[PDB]
Amino acid sequence: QVQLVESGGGVVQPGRSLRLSCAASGFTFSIYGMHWVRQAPGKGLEWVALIWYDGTNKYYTDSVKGRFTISRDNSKNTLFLQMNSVRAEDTAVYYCARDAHYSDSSGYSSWGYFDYWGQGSLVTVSSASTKGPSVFPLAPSSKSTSGGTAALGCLVKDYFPEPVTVSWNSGALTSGVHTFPAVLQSSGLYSLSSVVTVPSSSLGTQTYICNVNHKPSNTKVDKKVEPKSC
Amino acid sequence: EIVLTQSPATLSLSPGERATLSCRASQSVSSYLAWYQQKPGQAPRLLIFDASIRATGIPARFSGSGSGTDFTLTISSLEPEDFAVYYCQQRSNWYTFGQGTKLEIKRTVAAPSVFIFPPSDEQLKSGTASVVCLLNNFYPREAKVQWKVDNALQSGNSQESVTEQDSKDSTYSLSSTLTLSKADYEKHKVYACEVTHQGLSSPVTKSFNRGEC
């Protein structure tokens, strides 16, 4: 029955504050220590903070000490992380986790592991402003043909924040599509490509259009991808 | 601080096989070690704590052993739900994690098909040129992508991203994007992407001439 449901994530400018929430159900919240653990994009896990069942003791990892505050409201079954003076390096999925309060009929006692986890809440710390992508064709040619297969695609460049979605031919083309994970450019904006392979004989007769959606900026773009003669 | 070092970085196996993962601590953690499983987009899951105790609801095929500085997680018969990243964690002194071991699905070798795309005229008018090289449907993951502009090797001006293993065929695909200003792009003629992979007997190069597309 154990559930940990987080809320409060989103984009935050450097130096500003954001509070995360973690609402517990299905166990006796008020007798468990609780932790926060974070995971930066494409990196491993990092313990952030810990609070005792009764709220009396609190511990923090050095890089957040003096900027983040952990707290709990047992009457509301909720755990909090107050993040002040945020920095880009704080960008991460933040998880709440219950302390694995283990014991047995033999008095053996154990703790300090993480036995149940929230779904995670992404906090993106960035000075970038909301911006939709510029969408450009990745034109097929002899130089994007291998055997009887041609590749084509769309480059979805310079947007913020994540995510973007890409479809092909308003969803009618799905076989052979690869939409790559975004990369964060040195500019602070993201970029990704979406490609598809198709029979080379279809380049003369079949029209290929990518449909790009970036919900944060309300960007919607249909881009025809026409062949070239490289 | 206690540093945990996991090995190997990646373990490539098939369902049914025994998997053995190692975790080495920079100093003794006694038995204060746990193991976690994590899939893409999901939270981690506790498997084993106090070095050898299985968590509730964890299958018996998972087992942990060790004490002091050397620890092992064994999966006696791997199953498809076990392909994931595994982390170790200690609570002897504060709370630290290893950097993870990815257990991936082994399959046969497939050399990448290689494709190159020029910048669009539309992007060029706006002031920038992105050149894209695609490595499609290859396995194993290791590959090298080299960009050459008028036969000169590039560095510092490209970024790569890779898909997760395909759900149906277990291959990877990779995009490399080379970025130049429009002014620099128009200084050169030949744009080439050179790809090496253990499935390729020779490197595969694809190139185009600027203004011939």
């Binding site: 468990y32 220590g33 511990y59 309060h101 300090g112 | 609570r91």
Partner: peptide, 10 residues
């Protein structure tokens, strides 16, 4: 000042 003390009831 012990961050690894038992944070639970028991």
């Amino acid at each position: 000042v012990d961050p690894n003390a038992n944070p639970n009831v028991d």
